[PDB]
Amino acid sequence: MKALIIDDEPLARNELTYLLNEIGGFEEINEAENVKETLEALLINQYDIIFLDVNLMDENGIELGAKIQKMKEPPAIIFATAHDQYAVQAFELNATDYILKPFGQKRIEQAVNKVRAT
Structure with missing residues (x-):
């Protein structure tokens, strides 16, 4: 399972990365701090799930979602x-x-388990 974390604060990306690794089952975990990086990342990789903040600095997360x-x-x-x-x-x-x-x-496990559906 591949995941992408999008947050402006790098600490938050690290905290989330830790929890995901604790849960396990993630062959790849990349991060992004803005829309450009996010879209760039999405363009070249198939992500099963992305964690996204409501706003990236001044960019709107909801709209991005x-x-x-x-x-x-x-x-x-x-x-x-x-x-x-x-x-x-x-x-x-x-x-x-x-x-x-x-x-x-x-709580993160609940969500991750939620998306495990195929």
Whole structure:
């Protein structure tokens, strides 16, 4: 399973990377801090799931997620943020999950297990 973490704060990307490695089953985990890196990354790799903050500095994460769902085979979108006002929008753009910070390995596992469906 390959995952992509998109957050502006590199510490947050590290915390999430740790938990994913603790859970296991991830052959590859890449990160991105903006829309350019994110889209660049998506273009050259098939990701099963992406963890995305609600906003990347000034870029809008929700809108980015929305555009990502128009892909042929979009990866699952999980919002991981400290903001709790965009859950309704996340549901509207068919997001797989919306996780509020701070979160633990159990809650991330729930989401990851949610996307394990084929």
